[PDB]
From Swiss-Prot, chain B:
The cus system plays an important role in copper tolerance under anaerobic growth and, under extreme copper stress, in aerobic growth. Belongs to the resistance-nodulation-cell division (RND) (TC 2.A.6) family. The cus efflux system is composed of CusA, CusB, CusC and CusF. It comes from the Bacteria. Induction: Transcriptionally regulated by CusR in response to copper and silver ions. This is Cation efflux system protein CusA. It is found in: Cell inner membrane.
């Protein structure tokens, strides 16, 4: 969901949330609607492997 | 300052309250932006999440 550049991120997130609330029950058996993290396409700071 | 999320669960042992309610609540709350810490209370019959 793309907004008009400049708008507050959390506003947008707290905005999309209302039209995702009524669409949760409409979703299949047990698939959930996961919301994007509080980060962008740069938050990738530290990677590692076990 | 904190947000409270109480979920009532009659006649359920502390352990069952944990797995059925407190667990999915707390764990999924770990990723809510602004959360310093998350408190989980599994009492026999109720689930107080802070």
């Amino acid at each position: 969901v793309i907004f008009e550049d400049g708008t507050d991120p959390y506003w947008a997130r707290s905005r999309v949330l209302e039209y995702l609330n009524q669409v949760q029950g409409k979703l299949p058996a047990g698939v959930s609607a996961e919301l994007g993290p509080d980060a962008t396409g740069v938050g990738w700071i530290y990677e590692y492997a076990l | 300052v904190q947000v409270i999320i109480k979920t009532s669960y009659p006649g359920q042992a502390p352990q069952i309250v944990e797995n059925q309610v407190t667990y999915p609540l707390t764990t999924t709350m770990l990723s809510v932006p602004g959360a310093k810490t998350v408190r989980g209370f599994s009492q026999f019959g109720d689930s107080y999440v802070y």
